[PDB]
RNA sequence: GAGGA
């Protein structure tokens, strides 16, 4: 759902990330694969991290209660 | 006037629940196996 | 066989009726408990003797 | 408040006995929810 | 089944199921070694029964009445079943009566109008046959709940109907020709709300549904205008 | 120290089927006998053997 | 005018509440789009 | 000093820091709850430590999660 | 129904 926290391999902190993430894919158009570089992902154990991650956590919101 | 309802209803009620394609009288004689649970496993599943 | 085995034994007319443990009860509900199976068949065979004695 | 039952459709409060069952009273629905309890659940961090 | 050592005369024991034994749990020694689980028409006169039962369910499906209520008039049909104080009274008066027991007491609400749309019973019979069944269940041994069955028969919204719940709950202190057959009571209840309200339901689409008089709802509202001070909730 | 031997390498989509063991493992040791014939009930989620 | 009987209906065919809804309502009715 | 080597009942400020959470969605947008959000309840005793780690430049760390509308999240963490 | 293997 949200994003996790630390790469699971990696370790690395990756939950911060995510807001700044989307805020270059729309804003900037950035490529991901720049986009990913920018925050700093190196590795691919925490690339793949974010870019494959899926924010269900929208569509749970959307449920009135 | 005295029309009984409750055999379409149940009629077909059970044999969904159930899917021994027949009658409720029909136990092993009715066709079965239609009406399965829908298995909610995992979405593609 | 003489002892064991003579034809006119091979239809019954005394019937023997297994204990309970052979069709044990299910109290599967509570209150009251079905009947095993053998038990209805049995009480089907019994009604219909009791039938026959009465129509003779 | 302290609670006792939520209405499922209406999402309020509500308190009952053992007298109804049903009728968020507004809506009057029939399912309500057990107004999670207060004992301060522990929970282990891993 | 006791203890041999402990020896209290009520037996403190547990059931260890899961081991399937059956322990003293003061001295331990276990009592029962292996525990059984169990967890899964002329020659009878029940062919009267029968045929009650067959007519009853199929009044029951006419009706849409619960399994439960069809349960409580077989039962309560099967209480009777035979009595002199019955003799008779056509097979059908005591259907109908085990019926009205059936959903009183599931709680179920039904209007002797009803019964007798589904079963000829010419309803004097009818009143006369369920008295001495009453009676002779009361030996073998609350009207609110009508109120939503005509709120539904006629479409209506369940603000309303509370507020015709409040009106009744008060009508019972509100003697001051309170109900005298409450029936239109309820019936008046609920002209009083929709009155209240805006709904083109007129007095006579509800007294052609509900086979009331036309009259005795105005007779009653007459009343209700007085009565209207102690029916202000909100 | 380095391996000899050179290390295919890379992330690959693997997915999480049912039956974790807890469900599947299962001991008995002399606990409830069925009523027909008393020998030991069957299912583990009924204890059986 | 004569009551009969009472159909299973399948669910978003035509004759089912959210056989034409919108996500919203989807959401709104508790169901997932 | 390692839980298991300080007497106290389970916790202490010689081996422990409280830190607590309240959120609520107040706004009608989402509202995030980041690690920021955290605050120190237990007395530091003047020693650097528990802050979260902020090394986000927008200044609010990681993303703990996120509320709707009524939805309120409200708890106490041991460190 | 399920069903793993
Ligand atoms: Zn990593
Ligand atoms: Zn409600
Ligand atoms: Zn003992
Ligand atoms: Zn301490």
Same mark, same amino acid.
């Given at each position: 759902?949200?994003?996790?926290?630390?790469?699971?391999?990696?370790?690395?902190?990756?939950?911060?990330?995510?807001?700044?993430?989307?805020?270059?894919?729309?804003?900037?158009? /950035?490529?991901?694969?720049?986009?990913?570089?920018? /925050?700093? /992902?190196?590795?691919?154990?925490?690339?793949?991290?974010?870019?494959?991650?899926?924010?269900?956590?929208?569509?749970?919101?959307?449920?009135?209660? | 006037?005295?029309?009984?309802?409750?055999?379409?209803?149940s009629?077909?009620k059970y044999?969904?629940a159930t899917g021994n394609?027949?009658?409720q009288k029909?136990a092993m004689?009715?066709?079965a196996?239609?009406?399965?649970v829908?298995?909610?496993?995992?979405?593609?599943? | 066989?003489?002892?064991?085995?003579? @034809?006119?034994?091979?239809?019954?007319?005394?019937? @023997?009726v297994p204990p309970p443990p052979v069709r044990p009860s299910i109290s599967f509900n509570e209150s009251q408990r079905g009947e095993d199976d053998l038990t209805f068949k049995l009480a089907d065979?019994?009604?219909?003797?009791?039938?026959?004695?009465?129509?003779? | %408040?302290?609670?006792?039952?939520?209405? %499922?459709?209406?999402?309020?409060?509500?308190?009952?006995?053992?007298?109804? %069952?049903?009728?968020?009273?507004?809506?009057?629905?029939?399912?309500?929810?057990? %107004?999670?309890?207060?004992?301060?659940?522990?929970?282990?961090?891993? | 089944?006791?203890?041999?050592?402990?020896?209290?005369?009520?037996?403190?024991?547990?059931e260890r199921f899961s081991e399937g034994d059956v322990?003293?749990?003061?001295?331990?020694?276990?009592?029962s070694?292996k525990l059984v689980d169990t967890r899964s028409?002329?020659?009878?006169?029940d062919?009267?029964?029968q045929?009650?039962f067959?007519?009853?369910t199929? #009044?029951?499906?006419?009706?849409?009445?619960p399994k439960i209520?069809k349960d409580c008039?077989k039962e309560?049909?099967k209480?009777?079943?035979?009595?002199?104080?019955?003799?008779?009274?056509?097979?059908?008066?005591?259907?109908?009566?085990?019926?009205?027991?059936?959903?009183? =007491?599931?709680?179920?609400?039904?209007?002797?109008?009803?019964?007798?749309?589904?079963?000829?019973?010419?309803?004097?019979?009818?009143?006369?046959?369920?008295?001495?069944?009453?009676?002779?269940?009361?030996?073998?041994?609350?009207?609110?709940?009508?109120?939503?069955?005509?709120?539904?028969?006629?479409?209506?919204?369940?603000?309303?109907?509370?507020?015709?719940?409040?009106?009744?709950?008060?009508?019972?202190?509100?003697?001051?020709?309170?109900?005298?057959?409450?029936?239109?009571?309820?019936?008046?209840?609920?002209?009083?709300?929709?009155?209240?309200?805006?709904?083109?339901?007129?007095?006579?689409?509800?007294?052609?549904?509900?086979?009331?008089?036309?009259?005795?709802?105005?007779?009653?509202?007459?009343?209700?205008?007085?009565? =209207?001070?102690? #029916?202000?909730?909100? | 120290?380095?391996?000899?031997?050179?290390?295919?390498?890379?992330?690959?989509?693997?997915?999480?089927?049912?039956?974790?063991?807890?469900?599947?493992?299962?001991?008995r040791?002399?606990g409830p006998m069925q009523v027909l014939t008393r020998q030991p009930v069957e299912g583990r989620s009924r204890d059986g053997g | 005018?004569?009551?009969?009987?009472?159909?299973?209906?399948?669910?978003?065919?035509?004759?089912?509440?959210?056989?034409?809804?919108?996500?919203?309502?989807?959401?709104?009715?508790?169901?997932?789009? | 000093?390692?839980?298991?080597?300080?007497?106290?009942?389970?916790?202490?400020?010689?081996?422990?820091?409280?830190?607590?959470?309240? !959120?609520?969605?107040?706004?009608?947008?989402?509202? &995030?709850?980041?690690?920021?959000?955290?605050?120190?309840?237990?007395?530091?005793?003047?020693? &650097?430590?528990?802050?979260?780690?902020?090394?986000?430049?927008?200044?609010?760390?990681?993303?703990?999660?996120?509320?709707?509308?009524?939805?309120?999240?409200?708890?106490?963490?041991? !460190?």
């Amino acid at each position: 759902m949200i994003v996790p926290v630390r790469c699971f391999s990696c370790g690395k902190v990756v939950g911060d990330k995510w807001e700044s993430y989307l805020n270059l894919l729309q804003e900037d158009e /950035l490529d991901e694969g720049t986009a990913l570089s920018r /925050l700093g /992902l190196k590795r691919y154990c925490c690339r793949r991290m974010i870019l494959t991650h899926v924010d269900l956590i929208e569509k749970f919101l959307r449920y009135n209660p | 006037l005295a029309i009984n309802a409750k055999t379409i209803t149940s009629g077909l009620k059970y044999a969904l629940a159930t899917g021994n394609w027949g009658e409720q009288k029909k136990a092993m004689s009715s066709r079965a196996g239609v009406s399965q649970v829908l298995n909610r496993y995992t979405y593609s599943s | 066989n003489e002892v064991f085995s003579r @034809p006119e034994w091979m239809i019954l007319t005394c019937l @023997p009726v297994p204990p309970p443990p052979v069709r044990p009860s299910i109290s599967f509900n509570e209150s009251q408990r079905g009947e095993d199976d053998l038990t209805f068949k049995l009480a089907d065979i019994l009604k219909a003797n009791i039938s026959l004695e009465t129509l003779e | %408040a302290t609670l006792k039952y939520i209405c %499922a459709e209406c999402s309020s409060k509500l308190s009952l006995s053992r007298t109804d %069952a049903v009728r968020c009273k507004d809506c009057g629905h029939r399912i309500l929810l057990k %107004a999670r309890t207060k004992r301060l659940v522990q929970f282990e961090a891993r | 089944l006791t203890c041999p050592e402990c020896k209290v005369y009520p037996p403190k024991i547990v059931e260890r199921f899961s081991e399937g034994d059956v322990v003293c749990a003061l001295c331990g020694l276990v009592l029962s070694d292996k525990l059984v689980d169990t967890r899964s028409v002329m020659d009878k006169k029940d062919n009267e029964v029968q045929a009650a039962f067959a007519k009853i369910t199929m #009044l029951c499906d006419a009706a849409e009445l619960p399994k439960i209520v069809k349960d409580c008039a077989k039962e309560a049909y099967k209480l009777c079943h035979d009595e002199k104080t019955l003799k008779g009274k056509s097979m059908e008066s005591i259907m109908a009566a085990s019926i009205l027991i059936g959903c009183r =007491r599931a709680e179920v609400a039904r209007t002797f109008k009803e019964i007798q749309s589904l079963i000829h019973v010419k309803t004097k019979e009818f009143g006369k046959t369920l008295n001495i069944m009453k009676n002779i269940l009361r030996g073998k041994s609350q009207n609110l709940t009508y109120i939503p069955r005509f709120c539904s028969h006629l479409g209506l919204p369940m603000q309303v109907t509370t507020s015709a719940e409040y009106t009744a709950k008060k009508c019972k202190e509100i003697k001051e020709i309170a109900g005298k057959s409450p029936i239109t009571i309820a019936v008046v209840s609920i002209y009083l709300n929709i009155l209240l309200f805006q709904i083109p339901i007129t007095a006579a689409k509800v007294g052609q549904t509900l086979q009331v008089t036309e009259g005795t709802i105005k007779s009653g509202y007459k009343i209700l205008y007085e009565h =209207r001070d102690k #029916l202000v909730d909100p | 120290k380095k391996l000899m031997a050179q290390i295919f390498f890379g992330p690959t989509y693997y997915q999480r089927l049912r039956h974790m063991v807890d469900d599947k493992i299962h001991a008995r040791a002399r606990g409830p006998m069925q009523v027909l014939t008393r020998q030991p009930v069957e299912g583990r989620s009924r204890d059986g053997g | 005018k004569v009551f009969i009987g009472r159909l299973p209906i399948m669910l978003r065919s035509k004759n089912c509440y959210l056989s034409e809804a919108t996500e919203s309502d989807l959401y709104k009715l508790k169901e997932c789009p | 000093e390692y839980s298991r080597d300080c007497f106290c009942e389970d916790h202490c400020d010689k081996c422990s820091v409280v830190l607590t959470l309240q !959120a609520f969605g107040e706004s009608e947008s989402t509202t &995030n709850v980041y690690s920021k959000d955290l605050v120190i309840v237990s007395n530091l005793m003047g020693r &650097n430590i528990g802050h979260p780690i902020i090394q986000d430049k927008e200044g609010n760390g990681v993303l703990i999660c996120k509320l709707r509308k009524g939805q309120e999240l409200k708890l106490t963490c041991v !460190a």
